[PDB]
PDB file of C-alpha atoms and ligand atoms in Angstrom:
ATOM      1  CA  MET A  16     177.456  58.783  48.125  1.00 60.58           C
ATOM      2  CA  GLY A  17     177.489  56.296  45.336  1.00 63.32           C
ATOM      3  CA  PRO A  18     176.691  54.261  43.432  1.00 64.22           C
ATOM      4  CA  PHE A  19     179.956  54.243  41.348  1.00 64.65           C
ATOM      5  CA  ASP A  20     180.343  52.597  38.026  1.00 62.37           C
ATOM      6  CA  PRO A  21     183.599  50.828  37.025  1.00 63.09           C
ATOM      7  CA  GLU A  22     184.984  54.098  35.467  1.00 59.73           C
ATOM      8  CA  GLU A  23     184.207  56.111  38.515  1.00 64.51           C
ATOM      9  CA  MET A  24     186.008  53.572  40.758  1.00 67.05           C
ATOM     10  CA  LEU A  25     188.952  53.409  38.358  1.00 69.08           C
ATOM     11  CA  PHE A  26     189.118  57.230  38.450  1.00 70.92           C
ATOM     12  CA  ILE A  27     189.155  57.160  42.366  1.00 69.73           C
ATOM     13  CA  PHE A  28     191.812  54.445  42.606  1.00 68.26           C
ATOM     14  CA  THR A  29     194.163  55.970  40.048  1.00 70.15           C
ATOM     15  CA  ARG A  30     193.685  59.538  41.260  1.00 72.14           C
ATOM     16  CA  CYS A  31     194.479  58.409  44.822  1.00 72.22           C
ATOM     17  CA  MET A  32     197.532  56.467  43.704  1.00 72.33           C
ATOM     18  CA  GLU A  33     198.712  59.478  41.571  1.00 73.37           C
ATOM     19  CA  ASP A  34     198.477  61.706  44.669  1.00 74.91           C
ATOM     20  CA  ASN A  35     200.075  59.280  47.235  1.00 74.07           C
ATOM     21  CA  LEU A  36     202.621  57.013  45.643  1.00 70.91           C
ATOM     22  CA  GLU A  37     206.122  57.846  46.778  1.00 70.00           C
ATOM     23  CA  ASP A  38     208.595  59.343  44.262  1.00 70.27           C
ATOM     24  CA  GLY A  39     211.553  57.141  45.012  1.00 71.41           C
ATOM     25  CA  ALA A  40     212.606  53.470  44.982  1.00 68.92           C
ATOM     26  CA  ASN A  41     209.318  52.303  46.681  1.00 70.31           C
ATOM     27  CA  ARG A  42     207.058  53.596  43.906  1.00 66.52           C
ATOM     28  CA  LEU A  43     206.891  50.563  41.663  1.00 65.96           C
ATOM     29  CA  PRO A  44     206.692  47.991  44.639  1.00 65.38           C
ATOM     30  CA  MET A  45     203.858  50.134  46.189  1.00 65.13           C
ATOM     31  CA  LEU A  46     202.006  50.461  42.910  1.00 63.83           C
ATOM     32  CA  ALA A  47     202.045  46.715  42.343  1.00 61.91           C
ATOM     33  CA  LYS A  48     200.478  45.991  45.612  1.00 61.16           C
ATOM     34  CA  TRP A  49     197.881  48.833  45.781  1.00 65.50           C
ATOM     35  CA  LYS A  50     196.651  47.963  42.280  1.00 64.76           C
ATOM     36  CA  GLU A  51     195.789  44.486  43.618  1.00 65.96           C
ATOM     37  CA  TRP A  52     193.940  45.761  46.673  1.00 65.89           C
ATOM     38  CA  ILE A  53     196.902  44.936  48.928  1.00 65.16           C
ATOM     39  CA  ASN A  54     197.217  48.015  51.126  1.00 64.11           C
ATOM     40  CA  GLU A  55     200.852  47.675  52.166  1.00 63.69           C
ATOM     41  CA  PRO A  56     203.202  48.599  53.747  1.00 64.10           C
ATOM     42  CA  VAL A  57     200.736  49.456  56.527  1.00 64.32           C
ATOM     43  CA  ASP A  58     203.417  51.533  58.411  1.00 62.74           C
ATOM     44  CA  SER A  59     203.986  53.777  55.479  1.00 63.58           C
ATOM     45  CA  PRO A  60     202.462  57.237  55.445  1.00 65.83           C
ATOM     46  CA  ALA A  61     202.056  56.989  51.717  1.00 66.76           C
ATOM     47  CA  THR A  62     199.881  53.817  52.098  1.00 69.49           C
ATOM     48  CA  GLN A  63     197.981  55.396  54.941  1.00 70.81           C
ATOM     49  CA  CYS A  64     197.046  58.603  52.955  1.00 71.43           C
ATOM     50  CA  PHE A  65     196.298  56.426  49.775  1.00 71.96           C
ATOM     51  CA  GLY A  66     193.759  54.473  51.808  1.00 70.68           C
ATOM     52  CA  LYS A  67     192.299  57.518  53.431  1.00 71.88           C
ATOM     53  CA  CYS A  68     191.985  59.071  49.890  1.00 71.14           C
ATOM     54  CA  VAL A  69     190.042  56.130  48.540  1.00 72.75           C
ATOM     55  CA  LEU A  70     187.783  55.947  51.630  1.00 75.28           C
ATOM     56  CA  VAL A  71     187.000  59.730  51.371  1.00 77.18           C
ATOM     57  CA  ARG A  72     186.261  59.735  47.636  1.00 74.57           C
ATOM     58  CA  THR A  73     183.925  56.610  47.989  1.00 74.81           C
ATOM     59  CA  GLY A  74     182.311  58.158  51.021  1.00 73.86           C
ATOM     60  CA  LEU A  75     183.147  55.205  53.267  1.00 75.72           C
ATOM     61  CA  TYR A  76     185.006  57.725  55.536  1.00 79.66           C
ATOM     62  CA  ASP A  77     183.162  61.067  56.098  1.00 77.63           C
ATOM     63  CA  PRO A  78     185.830  63.666  57.052  1.00 77.21           C
ATOM     64  CA  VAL A  79     183.084  66.193  58.159  1.00 76.35           C
ATOM     65  CA  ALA A  80     181.355  63.574  60.413  1.00 75.85           C
ATOM     66  CA  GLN A  81     184.795  62.226  61.424  1.00 74.49           C
ATOM     67  CA  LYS A  82     183.207  58.749  61.211  1.00 76.97           C
ATOM     68  CA  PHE A  83     182.803  55.819  58.792  1.00 74.73           C
ATOM     69  CA  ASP A  84     179.550  55.477  56.723  1.00 73.99           C
ATOM     70  CA  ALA A  85     178.292  52.206  55.490  1.00 71.92           C
ATOM     71  CA  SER A  86     175.588  53.956  53.386  1.00 72.84           C
ATOM     72  CA  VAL A  87     177.646  53.764  50.179  1.00 69.26           C
ATOM     73  CA  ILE A  88     177.875  49.955  50.482  1.00 67.35           C
ATOM     74  CA  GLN A  89     174.149  49.485  50.388  1.00 68.48           C
ATOM     75  CA  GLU A  90     173.838  52.100  47.591  1.00 68.26           C
ATOM     76  CA  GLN A  91     176.492  50.205  45.625  1.00 70.12           C
ATOM     77  CA  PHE A  92     174.886  46.739  46.169  1.00 67.84           C
ATOM     78  CA  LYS A  93     171.452  48.170  45.159  1.00 68.62           C
ATOM     79  CA  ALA A  94     172.950  49.367  41.877  1.00 71.19           C
ATOM     80  CA  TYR A  95     174.980  46.190  41.359  1.00 72.55           C
ATOM     81  CA  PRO A  96     173.146  43.072  42.662  1.00 68.63           C
ATOM     82  CA  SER A  97     175.425  40.776  40.624  1.00 65.63           C
ATOM     83  CA  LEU A  98     178.474  41.978  42.549  1.00 65.55           C
ATOM     84  CA  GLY A  99     177.514  40.813  45.999  1.00 65.50           C
ATOM     85  CA  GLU A 100     175.897  38.178  48.038  1.00 64.81           C
ATOM     86  CA  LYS A 101     173.436  39.755  50.486  1.00 66.07           C
ATOM     87  CA  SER A 102     174.683  38.237  53.692  1.00 65.14           C
ATOM     88  CA  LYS A 103     178.358  39.081  52.883  1.00 65.19           C
ATOM     89  CA  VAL A 104     177.393  42.649  51.921  1.00 70.92           C
ATOM     90  CA  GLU A 105     175.491  43.008  55.100  1.00 71.80           C
ATOM     91  CA  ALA A 106     178.475  41.653  57.199  1.00 68.77           C
ATOM     92  CA  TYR A 107     180.713  44.206  55.477  1.00 67.11           C
ATOM     93  CA  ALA A 108     178.399  47.084  56.022  1.00 69.18           C
ATOM     94  CA  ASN A 109     177.899  45.997  59.676  1.00 67.99           C
ATOM     95  CA  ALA A 110     181.701  45.988  60.207  1.00 66.79           C
ATOM     96  CA  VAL A 111     181.902  49.558  58.767  1.00 69.41           C
ATOM     97  CA  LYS A 112     178.910  50.807  60.854  1.00 67.39           C
ATOM     98  CA  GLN A 113     180.529  49.419  64.003  1.00 67.00           C
ATOM     99  CA  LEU A 114     183.940  51.079  63.590  1.00 62.40           C
ATOM    100  CA  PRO A 115     184.476  53.807  66.151  1.00 64.08           C
ATOM    101  CA  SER A 116     184.398  57.483  65.375  1.00 62.93           C
ATOM    102  CA  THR A 117     187.816  58.237  63.922  1.00 61.76           C
ATOM    103  CA  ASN A 118     190.084  61.254  63.689  1.00 66.09           C
ATOM    104  CA  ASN A 119     190.490  62.897  60.175  1.00 63.67           C
ATOM    105  CA  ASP A 120     194.188  62.029  59.742  1.00 62.53           C
ATOM    106  CA  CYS A 121     195.588  59.363  57.388  1.00 62.90           C
ATOM    107  CA  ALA A 122     197.104  57.140  59.991  1.00 64.71           C
ATOM    108  CA  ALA A 123     193.900  56.951  62.182  1.00 66.88           C
ATOM    109  CA  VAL A 124     191.568  56.343  59.262  1.00 65.96           C
ATOM    110  CA  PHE A 125     193.838  53.778  57.709  1.00 62.53           C
ATOM    111  CA  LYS A 126     194.408  51.914  60.997  1.00 62.60           C
ATOM    112  CA  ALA A 127     190.687  51.852  61.773  1.00 62.17           C
ATOM    113  CA  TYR A 128     189.646  50.549  58.317  1.00 59.86           C
ATOM    114  CA  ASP A 129     192.502  48.029  57.668  1.00 62.12           C
ATOM    115  CA  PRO A 130     190.831  45.142  59.706  1.00 61.07           C
ATOM    116  CA  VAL A 131     187.692  45.701  57.723  1.00 62.19           C
ATOM    117  CA  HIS A 132     189.595  45.745  54.440  1.00 62.86           C
ATOM    118  CA  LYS A 133     191.230  42.407  55.266  1.00 62.40           C
ATOM    119  CA  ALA A 134     188.199  40.745  56.795  1.00 60.23           C
ATOM    120  CA  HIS A 135     185.994  41.761  53.861  1.00 60.44           C
ATOM    121  CA  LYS A 136     188.460  41.984  51.032  1.00 58.45           C
ATOM    122  CA  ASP A 137     186.630  39.965  48.430  1.00 60.71           C
ATOM    123  CA  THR A 138     183.247  41.459  49.402  1.00 63.89           C
ATOM    124  CA  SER A 139     184.528  45.036  48.942  1.00 64.89           C
ATOM    125  CA  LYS A 140     186.708  44.265  45.896  1.00 63.78           C
ATOM    126  CA  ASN A 141     183.807  42.653  44.109  1.00 64.84           C
ATOM    127  CA  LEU A 142     181.325  45.399  44.990  1.00 65.04           C
ATOM    128  CA  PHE A 143     183.482  48.379  44.097  1.00 65.54           C
ATOM    129  CA  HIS A 144     184.635  47.155  40.670  1.00 67.84           C
ATOM    130  CA  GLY A 145     188.034  45.709  41.727  1.00 68.65           C
ATOM    131  CA  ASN A 146     187.289  42.116  40.498  1.00 70.95           C
ATOM    132  CA  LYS A 147     189.032  41.933  37.119  1.00 69.06           C
ATOM    133  CA  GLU A 148     186.734  39.211  35.564  1.00 71.09           C
ATOM    134  CA  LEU A 149     183.494  40.725  36.843  1.00 70.07           C
ATOM    135  CA  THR A 150     184.474  44.324  35.833  1.00 70.16           C
ATOM    136  CA  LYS A 151     185.468  42.977  32.301  1.00 71.27           C
ATOM    137  CA  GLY A 152     181.966  41.678  31.913  1.00 70.53           C
ATOM    138  CA  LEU A 153     180.300  44.890  33.086  1.00 64.84           C
ATOM    139  CA  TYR A 154     182.421  46.946  30.578  1.00 68.87           C
ATOM    140  CA  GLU A 155     181.209  44.736  27.801  1.00 71.26           C
ATOM    141  CA  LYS A 156     177.672  45.046  28.824  1.00 72.56           C
ATOM    142  CA  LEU A 157     177.931  48.850  28.925  1.00 75.81           C
ATOM    143  CA  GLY A 158     179.997  49.121  25.749  1.00 78.45           C
ATOM    144  CA  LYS A 159     179.713  52.627  24.138  1.00 78.24           C
ATOM    145  CA  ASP A 160     177.713  53.885  27.127  1.00 77.51           C
ATOM    146  CA  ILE A 161     180.669  54.105  29.461  1.00 79.03           C
ATOM    147  CA  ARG A 162     184.147  55.424  28.957  1.00 78.25           C
ATOM    148  CA  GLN A 163     186.235  52.183  28.436  1.00 79.29           C
ATOM    149  CA  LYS A 164     189.655  51.409  29.749  1.00 75.51           C
ATOM    150  CA  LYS A 165     192.349  53.235  27.686  1.00 77.53           C
ATOM    151  CA  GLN A 166     189.737  55.430  25.890  1.00 80.60           C
ATOM    152  CA  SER A 167     190.059  59.188  25.753  1.00 81.91           C
ATOM    153  CA  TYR A 168     187.152  60.563  27.759  1.00 79.15           C
ATOM    154  CA  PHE A 169     186.693  63.240  25.188  1.00 77.96           C
ATOM    155  CA  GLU A 170     186.413  60.515  22.461  1.00 78.32           C
ATOM    156  CA  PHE A 171     183.777  58.688  24.561  1.00 80.84           C
ATOM    157  CA  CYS A 172     181.700  61.749  24.692  1.00 80.45           C
ATOM    158  CA  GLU A 173     182.210  62.653  21.066  1.00 74.81           C
ATOM    159  CA  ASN A 174     181.106  59.202  19.999  1.00 74.73           C
ATOM    160  CA  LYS A 175     177.914  59.323  22.029  1.00 74.91           C
ATOM    161  CA  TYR A 176     176.835  62.826  20.734  1.00 73.57           C
ATOM    162  CA  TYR A 177     178.404  63.049  17.293  1.00 77.13           C
ATOM    163  CA  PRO A 178     178.627  59.329  16.201  1.00 76.03           C
ATOM    164  CA  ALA A 179     180.867  58.072  13.466  1.00 76.56           C
ATOM    165  CA  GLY A 180     178.972  57.391  10.284  1.00 76.31           C
ATOM    166  CA  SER A 181     176.332  59.989  11.116  1.00 77.84           C
ATOM    167  CA  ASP A 182     175.768  63.539   9.649  1.00 77.91           C
ATOM    168  CA  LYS A 183     176.756  64.908  13.046  1.00 75.31           C
ATOM    169  CA  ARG A 184     180.310  63.680  12.908  1.00 72.60           C
ATOM    170  CA  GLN A 185     181.443  66.684  10.776  1.00 73.61           C
ATOM    171  CA  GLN A 186     180.820  69.025  13.697  1.00 74.98           C
ATOM    172  CA  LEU A 187     183.860  67.520  15.507  1.00 75.65           C
ATOM    173  CA  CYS A 188     186.027  69.676  13.154  1.00 72.44           C
ATOM    174  CA  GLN A 189     184.739  72.829  14.830  1.00 75.52           C
ATOM    175  CA  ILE A 190     184.299  71.343  18.305  1.00 75.61           C
ATOM    176  CA  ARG A 191     187.982  70.308  18.499  1.00 78.48           C
ATOM    177  CA  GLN A 192     189.116  73.773  17.526  1.00 75.50           C
ATOM    178  CA  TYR A 193     187.360  75.177  20.604  1.00 71.87           C
ATOM    179  CA  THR A 194     184.346  76.649  18.727  1.00 73.91           C
ATOM    180  CA  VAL A 195     181.556  77.049  21.397  1.00 72.44           C
ATOM    181  CA  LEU A 196     178.314  75.909  19.760  1.00 74.72           C
ATOM    182  CA  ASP A 197     174.997  77.025  21.169  1.00 76.54           C
ATOM    183  CA  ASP A 198     172.638  74.124  20.626  1.00 79.66           C
ATOM    184  CA  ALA A 199     171.174  71.619  23.170  1.00 82.70           C
ATOM    185  CA  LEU A 200     173.240  68.766  21.764  1.00 83.15           C
ATOM    186  CA  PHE A 201     176.546  70.645  22.296  1.00 85.91           C
ATOM    187  CA  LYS A 202     175.548  71.592  25.885  1.00 83.79           C
ATOM    188  CA  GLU A 203     174.843  67.946  26.672  1.00 81.92           C
ATOM    189  CA  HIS A 204     178.121  66.836  25.079  1.00 81.18           C
ATOM    190  CA  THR A 205     179.973  69.486  27.036  1.00 80.42           C
ATOM    191  CA  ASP A 206     178.351  68.347  30.247  1.00 78.35           C
ATOM    192  CA  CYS A 207     179.591  64.804  29.424  1.00 81.63           C
ATOM    193  CA  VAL A 208     183.164  66.040  29.101  1.00 85.38           C
ATOM    194  CA  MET A 209     183.229  68.571  31.986  1.00 87.49           C
ATOM    195  CA  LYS A 210     181.786  65.948  34.393  1.00 90.11           C
ATOM    196  CA  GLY A 211     184.144  63.316  32.990  1.00 91.53           C
ATOM    197  CA  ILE A 212     187.207  65.260  33.795  1.00 92.34           C
ATOM    198  CA  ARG A 213     185.581  66.274  37.116  1.00 95.11           C
ATOM    199  CA  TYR A 214     185.549  70.053  36.508  1.00 94.51           C
ATOM    200  CA  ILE A 215     181.821  69.738  37.249  1.00 93.48           C
ATOM    201  CA  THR A 216     180.512  67.445  39.996  1.00 89.05           C
ATOM    202  CA  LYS A 217     177.550  65.071  39.763  1.00 88.45           C
ATOM    203  CA  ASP A 218     175.291  67.791  41.343  1.00 89.25           C
ATOM    204  CA  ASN A 219     176.357  70.282  38.647  1.00 85.96           C
ATOM    205  CA  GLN A 220     178.796  72.231  40.807  1.00 87.62           C
ATOM    206  CA  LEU A 221     182.071  73.806  39.659  1.00 86.37           C
ATOM    207  CA  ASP A 222     185.210  72.215  41.145  1.00 85.48           C
ATOM    208  CA  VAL A 223     187.785  74.929  40.955  1.00 84.08           C
ATOM    209  CA  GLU A 224     190.493  72.749  42.512  1.00 85.04           C
ATOM    210  CA  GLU A 225     190.256  70.246  39.623  1.00 85.23           C
ATOM    211  CA  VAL A 226     190.617  72.985  37.060  1.00 85.83           C
ATOM    212  CA  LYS A 227     193.629  74.391  39.029  1.00 87.51           C
ATOM    213  CA  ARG A 228     195.175  70.848  39.100  1.00 87.15           C
ATOM    214  CA  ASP A 229     195.227  70.750  35.322  1.00 90.74           C
ATOM    215  CA  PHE A 230     196.722  74.275  35.041  1.00 87.45           C
ATOM    216  CA  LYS A 231     199.522  73.304  37.406  1.00 87.71           C
ATOM    217  CA  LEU A 232     200.265  70.146  35.360  1.00 91.55           C
ATOM    218  CA  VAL A 233     201.001  72.441  32.373  1.00 92.72           C
ATOM    219  CA  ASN A 234     203.218  74.672  34.455  1.00 89.20           C
ATOM    220  CA  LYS A 235     200.724  77.574  34.576  1.00 88.17           C
ATOM    221  CA  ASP A 236     199.975  79.756  37.545  1.00 89.61           C
ATOM    222  CA  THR A 237     196.345  79.643  38.815  1.00 92.51           C
ATOM    223  CA  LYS A 238     195.781  83.070  40.292  1.00 94.40           C
ATOM    224  CA  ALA A 239     194.417  84.568  37.037  1.00 92.54           C
ATOM    225  CA  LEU A 240     192.288  81.447  36.464  1.00 93.07           C
ATOM    226  CA  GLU A 241     190.772  81.697  39.970  1.00 93.44           C
ATOM    227  CA  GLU A 242     189.703  85.397  39.233  1.00 93.38           C
ATOM    228  CA  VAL A 243     188.270  84.352  35.980  1.00 95.64           C
ATOM    229  CA  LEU A 244     186.310  81.493  37.533  1.00 96.97           C
ATOM    230  CA  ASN A 245     185.052  83.733  40.269  1.00 97.55           C
ATOM    231  CA  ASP A 246     183.672  86.044  37.605  1.00 97.86           C
ATOM    232  CA  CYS A 247     182.165  83.112  35.659  1.00 97.28           C
ATOM    233  CA  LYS A 248     180.591  81.877  38.913  1.00 95.54           C
ATOM    234  CA  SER A 249     179.137  85.295  39.634  1.00 96.52           C
ATOM    235  CA  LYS A 250     177.203  84.813  36.302  1.00 96.26           C
ATOM    236  CA  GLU A 251     176.382  81.189  36.709  1.00 95.83           C
ATOM    237  CA  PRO A 252     173.098  80.227  35.073  1.00 98.52           C
ATOM    238  CA  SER A 253     170.177  78.860  37.178  1.00 99.25           C
ATOM    239  CA  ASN A 254     169.371  75.925  34.937  1.00 99.15           C
ATOM    240  CA  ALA A 255     171.559  73.131  36.302  1.00 99.53           C
ATOM    241  CA  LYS A 256     171.971  71.351  32.860  1.00100.14           C
ATOM    242  CA  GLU A 257     173.656  74.344  31.344  1.00104.71           C
ATOM    243  CA  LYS A 258     176.326  74.885  33.994  1.00102.62           C
ATOM    244  CA  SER A 259     179.048  72.681  32.336  1.00104.19           C
ATOM    245  CA  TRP A 260     178.610  74.526  29.063  1.00103.91           C
ATOM    246  CA  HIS A 261     178.533  77.885  30.814  1.00102.09           C
ATOM    247  CA  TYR A 262     181.933  77.343  32.377  1.00103.48           C
ATOM    248  CA  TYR A 263     183.392  75.853  29.275  1.00103.63           C
ATOM    249  CA  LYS A 264     182.347  78.823  27.182  1.00104.53           C
ATOM    250  CA  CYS A 265     183.403  81.254  29.909  1.00102.85           C
ATOM    251  CA  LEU A 266     186.847  79.823  30.128  1.00101.62           C
ATOM    252  CA  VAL A 267     187.295  79.474  26.246  1.00102.22           C
ATOM    253  CA  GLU A 268     186.364  83.174  25.812  1.00104.50           C
ATOM    254  CA  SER A 269     188.205  84.459  28.856  1.00106.52           C
ATOM    255  CA  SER A 270     191.746  86.065  29.480  1.00105.08           C
ATOM    256  CA  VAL A 271     193.033  82.726  30.444  1.00107.26           C
ATOM    257  CA  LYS A 272     191.820  80.937  27.234  1.00108.46           C
ATOM    258  CA  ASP A 273     195.296  80.010  25.951  1.00108.71           C
ATOM    259  CA  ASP A 274     196.376  78.487  29.251  1.00107.29           C
ATOM    260  CA  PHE A 275     192.966  76.808  29.527  1.00107.58           C
ATOM    261  CA  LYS A 276     193.197  75.186  26.016  1.00107.66           C
ATOM    262  CA  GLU A 277     196.748  74.028  26.855  1.00108.89           C
ATOM    263  CA  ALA A 278     195.561  72.485  30.174  1.00108.79           C
ATOM    264  CA  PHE A 279     192.406  70.972  28.646  1.00107.86           C
ATOM    265  CA  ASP A 280     194.437  69.524  25.771  1.00108.22           C
ATOM    266  CA  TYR A 281     196.838  67.818  28.282  1.00112.49           C
ATOM    267  CA  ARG A 282     193.969  66.611  30.384  1.00114.59           C
ATOM    268  CA  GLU A 283     192.455  64.976  27.231  1.00115.33           C
ATOM    269  CA  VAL A 284     195.794  63.071  26.721  1.00116.00           C
ATOM    270  CA  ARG A 285     195.990  61.925  30.351  1.00117.57           C
ATOM    271  CA  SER A 286     192.283  60.845  30.280  1.00116.56           C
ATOM    272  CA  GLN A 287     193.370  58.189  27.660  1.00118.00           C
ATOM    273  CA  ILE A 288     195.169  56.224  30.380  1.00117.08           C
ATOM    274  CA  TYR A 289     193.968  56.733  33.940  1.00118.97           C
ATOM    275  CA  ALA A 290     197.297  55.269  35.285  1.00117.72           C
ATOM    276  CA  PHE A 291     199.204  57.802  33.071  1.00120.05           C
ATOM    277  CA  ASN A 292     201.456  59.059  35.866  1.00120.93           C
ATOM    278  CA  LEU A 293     201.623  55.953  38.072  1.00121.41           C
ATOM    279  CA  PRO A 294     204.794  54.002  36.988  1.00119.91           C
ATOM    280  CA  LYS A 295     206.554  57.454  37.225  1.00119.88           C
ATOM    281  CA  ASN A 296     205.425  61.127  37.122  1.00122.21           C
ATOM    282  CA  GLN A 297     205.603  61.987  33.328  1.00124.01           C
ATOM    283  CA  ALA A 298     207.264  65.231  32.311  1.00123.02           C
ATOM    284  CA  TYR A 299     204.944  67.641  30.378  1.00125.14           C
ATOM    285  CA  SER A 300     206.140  69.114  27.190  1.00126.07           C
ATOM    286  CA  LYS A 301     203.930  71.449  25.124  1.00126.89           C
ATOM    287  CA  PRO A 302     203.037  69.635  21.773  1.00124.39           C
ATOM    288  CA  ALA A 303     204.323  71.246  18.585  1.00124.41           C
ATOM    289  CA  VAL A 304     201.616  73.543  17.012  1.00123.74           C
ATOM    290  CA  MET A 305     192.804  68.708  11.168  1.00123.79           C
ATOM    291  CA  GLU A 306     191.392  65.314  10.413  1.00126.66           C
ATOM    292  CA  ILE A 307     188.223  63.479  11.816  1.00126.39           C
ATOM    293  CA  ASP A 308     188.392  59.631  11.228  1.00129.91           C
ATOM    294  CA  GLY A 309     190.941  60.249   8.505  1.00129.89           C
ATOM    295  CA  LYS A 310     188.707  62.765   6.662  1.00132.57           C
ATOM    296  CA  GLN A 311     190.065  66.229   6.111  1.00130.67           C
ATOM    297  CA  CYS A 312     188.278  69.169   7.905  1.00126.38           C
ATOM    298  CA  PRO A 313     187.078  71.991   5.665  1.00126.33           C
ATOM    299  CA  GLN A 314     188.583  74.313   8.318  1.00123.91           C
TER     300      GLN A 314
HETATM  301 CL1  LIG B  16     192.563  53.553  31.608  1.00122.10          CL
END
């Protein structure tokens, strides 16, 4: 588990908040605290499950082992020497290592970790891209090489593989209209997108639940999707680097293609603001039915 870059941690925090914030009067007060690494109220099931969510996605809590795991702390510090002081990182890792084996329920996981969170707040916040000043500097260093805050993930990938001002830019006319290109460049670009929206994991595996999540958000049933994906999986290519493209092509050409395009389009919109749904769950409405950088597409 790990290391995680700033975008990866932002994804984790915002996803866990989206899934765990209450839907009533407590929503905004809780959001204001959790955003600032204040895991309160400690007695709230919402806070407890939020905390467990973050710990599971980072690998600090291993739900299979039913124990905490400090390995990610060392992986994180190795990747980001500027974000920790060795003695402090070691003290934090030690505190995690010495936590007892803990049941895989929100309350138990949260209660066990909370003392560590508080005793090592700055250490953990700095290391895992929660320090606003440090993270701003890292985003500047990375520039075009990482998806930036408030940037469409699709645009991040497009700009990497089909850069503005290049003879490649024109291909976006076809790409944005769901034309499935066959070349190595497009396969890499599609890997960038599919991994960026988490349809494909870091180890090139399909995450059916993530695709389903996006169907449900556009009010589409997922039974037909699951059947299509099962068929696509039965014909999965053996070369790891082609798996993202394989699933993209399969979905685009399948009997769920229209629902897929609708779901994928809305995911692109939501990828522009990771906190899209946090102040309040936003209602989805199908956009009314092309230009690239102001230039008219010939198709
Ligand atoms: Cl964002």
